[PDB]
Amino acid sequence: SNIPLEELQRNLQFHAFISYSGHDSFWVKNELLPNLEKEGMQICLHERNFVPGKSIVENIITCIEKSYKSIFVLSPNFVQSEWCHYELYFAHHNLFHEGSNSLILILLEPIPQYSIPSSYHKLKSLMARRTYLEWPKEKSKRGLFWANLRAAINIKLTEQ
């Protein structure tokens, strides 16, 4: 019931790469990863999988290149401690060709406008699309979130 990565055009190793902030580690390790790995998905994680002897940027790009999708756990913590790596890399490399299925945005916590610096142009461009999956506060809507998340991971990539 999951995408066979070996039957893809590229030699991908993971179904999705999860980029998150350390301050959001509890939800990622007790909700995100359990719900994805129990379904049989291979996850490139921000903590593990990173190879020693390389920079943090190289480890992130390596996880992205070996993953069918990339997941950003958007939150005030993610903006202040994680997004800068992507804002700097997007200024020179546009590997996510705009409107593409490659990037999946999870809004774990609402991001206030004041906490977003005026220099994070790509972050404002991504959140303006209103295509992110919001973590619901109601427990009854949790099952809808996971169904939407697994679908976003397993949907066919748009031609980019």
From Swiss-Prot:
GO cellular component, one term: phagocytic vesicle membrane
UniProt domain TIR: residue ranges: 12-153
Tissue: Ubiquitous. Highly expressed in spleen, ovary, peripheral blood leukocytes, thymus and small intestine.
Subcellular location: Cell membrane; Cytoplasmic vesicle, Phagosome membrane; Membrane raft; Golgi apparatus
Cytoplasmic side: 2-160
Predominant localisation class: membrane
A Gene Ontology molecular function term of the record: NAD+ nucleosidase activity, cyclic ADP-ribose generating
Oligomer status and interactors: Interacts (via extracellular domain) with TLR2. TLR2 seems to exist in heterodimers with either TLR1 or TLR6 before stimulation by the ligand. The heterodimers form bigger oligomers in response to their corresponding ligands as well as further heterotypic associations with other receptors such as CD14 and/or CD36. The activation cluster TLR2:TLR1:CD14 forms in response to triacylated lipopeptides. Binds MYD88 (via TIR domain). Interacts with CNPY3.
Function field: Participates in the innate immune response to microbial agents. Specifically recognizes diacylated and triacylated lipopeptides. Cooperates with TLR2 to mediate the innate immune response to bacterial lipoproteins or lipopeptides. Forms the activation cluster TLR2:TLR1:CD14 in response to triacylated lipopeptides, this cluster triggers signaling from the cell surface and subsequently is targeted to the Golgi in a lipid-raft dependent pathway. Acts via MYD88 and TRAF6, leading to NF-kappa-B activation, cytokine secretion and the inflammatory response.
Family indicated by similarity: Belongs to the Toll-like receptor family.
Name recorded for this polypeptide: Toll-like receptor 1
Source species: Homo sapiens (Human)
